[PDB]
Amino acid sequence: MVIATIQAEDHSQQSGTQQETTTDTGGGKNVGYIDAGDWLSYAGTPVNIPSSGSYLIEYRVASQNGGGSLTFEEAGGAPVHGTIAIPATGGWQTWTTIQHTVNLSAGSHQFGIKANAGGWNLNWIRINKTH
Ligand SMILES: OC[C@H]1O[C@@H](O[C@H]2[C@H](O)[C@@H](O)[C@H](O[C@@H]3[C@@H](O)[C@H](O[C@H]4[C@H](O)[C@@H](O)[C@H](O)O[C@@H]4CO)O[C@H](CO)[C@H]3O)O[C@@H]2CO)[C@H](O)[C@@H](O)[C@@H]1O
Ligand SMILES: [Ca+2]
Ligand SMILES: [Ca+2]
Ligand SMILES: [Cl-]
């Protein structure tokens, strides 16, 4: 089941990005202007992970030219949970949902996202239990 949908713009701390209106389905905002080394923290909204095992993490992303990469991690930078490439969608507001599985320990987590490479926008993240 879905543990949580986290809107990208609901970060508690960030470095180097900016919010903008999104035209994706449902409206609201996206995080843009993401460059290599930029980061977002969700430490202000802890997410309880009910059991140790596999979780499918989904990212609602847009990218004009491609080349982007992110790491899904614990806020602060360690441990790291996984990395995923962001494909080109051909527009800054042409959206798609990408997916990877990570393995998480049970308990209270504070998540963060680090941009390894830029060129992508983020609308929201969804964390799913798949074990
Ligand atoms: O890897 C070496 C390179 O590091 C670059 O700087 C990194 C830095 O080493 C790394 O620790 C940092 O991780 C951030 C982390 O600082 C930040 O912590 C937040 C926290 O989430 C927030 O809740 C709290 O309020 O404030 C903290 C900041 O004081 O969390 C994010 C998300 O988890 C982490 O990615 O990131 C830096 C930038 O990439 C150097 O710039 C480079 O010179 C060096 O070679
Ligand atoms: Ca930036
Ligand atoms: Ca959003
Ligand atoms: Cl970059």
UniProtKB/TrEMBL annotation:
Family recorded in the similarity comment: Belongs to the glycosyl hydrolase 5 (cellulase A) family.
Segments traversing the membrane: none
Keywords (A to Z) from UniProt: Calcium, Glycosidase, Hydrolase, Metal-binding, Signal
Residues of the full protein shown: 493 to 622 of 622
Protein name per UniProt: Cellulase B
GO biological process: polysaccharide catabolic process
One MF annotation (Gene Ontology) recorded for this entry: carbohydrate binding
Binding site for Ca(2+) 1: 7, 9, 29, 123
Segments forming domain CBM6: 4-128
Residues covered by region (Disordered): 8-29
Low complexity bias locations: 13-24
Binding site for Ca(2+) 2: 16, 33, 35, 38
